[PDB]
Amino acid sequence: MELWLVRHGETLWNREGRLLGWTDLPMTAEGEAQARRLKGALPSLPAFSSDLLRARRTAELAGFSPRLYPELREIHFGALEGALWETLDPRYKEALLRFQGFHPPGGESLSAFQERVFRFLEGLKAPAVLFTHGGVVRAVLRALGEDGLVPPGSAVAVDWPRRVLVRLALD
């Protein structure tokens, strides 16, 4: 089934290289600009969005009025929230690079995160635009056997759960 996934515009922690999960940070001005650029580029489909500020504000600026769902949130990094990528212990770095066996103290395991996400996608009964986070888009792209890193404010359309349709980036 056709689905459009949107990664929210950038926040400060993106340029700072800090893990951003359930920490509810706002986007930067550039993030807001990235969200506006999406207007007129996404299809007119029912919209759903993470309840975190940066996501639904991206939804708003993109010209949508999405229903909110916590299930579309980024992974909960637990004690690793706000942690600089550079300083992460090898085990966490590798876990995130290889996207496997990630168990952050006080947070969500990558396994639990994927089940939440894939379970939400399975519940969808019709094509829709999903305003979410980098880790969610990444989970979906990798599961479809592809590189999961896309630019903030960019989008991807897939035919879940068979293949990737298009990657839309607006410079």
Ligand SMILES: [Cl-]
């Ligand atoms: Cl379809």
Ligand SMILES: [Cl-]
């Ligand atoms: Cl895991």
Ligand SMILES: [Cl-]
């Ligand atoms: Cl299938």
